[PDB]
């Protein structure tokens, strides 16, 4: 999902930040 995309990761690190999944 968004934590997969470096971009939408980049710009939600509070929720890719546990375990950056899809």
Do not use: F, K, V
């Amino acid at each position: 999902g968004c934590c997969s995309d470096p971009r939408c990761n980049y710009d939600h690190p509070e929720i890719c930040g546990g375990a950056a999944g899809g």
